[PDB]
């Protein structure tokens, strides 16, 4: 129906003009379930990090936000062990005019600059605020063994 | 089994009787339409709250107590029907 046309148009845009370092597609037979791949930003301690995540579309779209969840896990204050993401676009200030490219770009940009106001894991955010070098070395240690 | 234009069942003699009970000796000719409009507005206001009360209880019949509660909520208490 309308959501089918919307998702097909989104996929057509994604195929014609893919963004940089993000690649999304339909993982399964149905168009509701998607798989996405994100490369770590160049100016970050996440060098060489490739991350796979799943996209689950609610029945009513785009009037309700999609559910993105990391398959792996990352050491970021806004991501927990299960892979959940704490971003305002995802849940709070979501609007139907937004597209998949915008939310994926925002997720990618989150890695460069963490949000310490409402982190998902307070202890690692406190560690990072205590010292940046420790946070960078710990993130590099995790990402040099689990990202690849 | 819909119902249409039933407000004409509030006939002119009934309005004359109500005015007589109210103490009115002589009545203009355009009073009846104004009274019909006023009565319709009052009925809508009361019945909306009555139906709201009956749906909150997961019922399908508008009992007398819903009407009494709506009337009390609107500032018009009614004695003699319970509560």
């Amino acid at each position: 129906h309308m959501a089918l046309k919307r998702i097909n148009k989104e996929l057509s845009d994604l195929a014609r003009d893919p963004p940089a370092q993000i690649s999304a597609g339909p993982v399964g037979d149905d168009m509701f379930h998607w798989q996405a791949t994100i490369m770590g930003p160049n100016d970050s301690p996440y060098q060489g990090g490739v991350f796979f995540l799943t996209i689950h579309f609610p029945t009513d779209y785009p009037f309700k936000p999609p559910k993105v969840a990391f398959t792996t896990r990352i050491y970021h204050p806004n991501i927990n062990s299960n892979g959940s993401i704490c971003l305002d676009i995802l849940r709070s200030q979501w609007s139907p005019a937004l597209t998949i490219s915008k939310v994926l770009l925002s997720i990618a940009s989150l890695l460069d600059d963490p949000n310490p106001d409402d982190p998902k894991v307070p202890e690692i955010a406190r560690i990072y605020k205590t010292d940046r070098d420790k946070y960078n070395r710990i993130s590099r240690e995790w990402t040099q063994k689990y990202a690849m | 089994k819909v119902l249409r234009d039933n407000i004409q069942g509030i006939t002119k003699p009934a309005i004359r009787r109500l005015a007589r009970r109210g103490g009115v000796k002589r009545i203009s000719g355009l009073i009846y339409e104004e009274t019909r409009g006023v009565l319709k507005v009052f009925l809508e206001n009361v019945i909306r709250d009555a139906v709201t009360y009956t749906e909150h209880a997961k019922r399908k019949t508008v009992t007398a107590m819903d009407v009494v509660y709506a009337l009390k909520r609107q500032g018009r208490t009614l004695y003699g029907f319970g509560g």
Partner: protein, 93 residues
Amino acid sequence: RSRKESYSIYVYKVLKQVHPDTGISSKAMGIMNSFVNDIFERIAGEASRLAHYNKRSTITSREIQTAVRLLLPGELAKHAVSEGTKAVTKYTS
């Protein structure tokens, strides 16, 4: 079945106290029941609000007396206050 409580018998006792000969029909008794319930709700709500205002957690007889003074008009309020005070004084001893 179910049991429904009402103030019918007490109203009849009071009626036979004031007018030993007159009876009372069903609709009038229903009206009296509604009236008693309404006055109970008014006075109880006012007393509860008075208790809340002063940071109390109890309803004593002085909250009820102040609520009676607030609700009822002049002579009615004076007579009701006298009746309640007399009843409490007779009950406590």
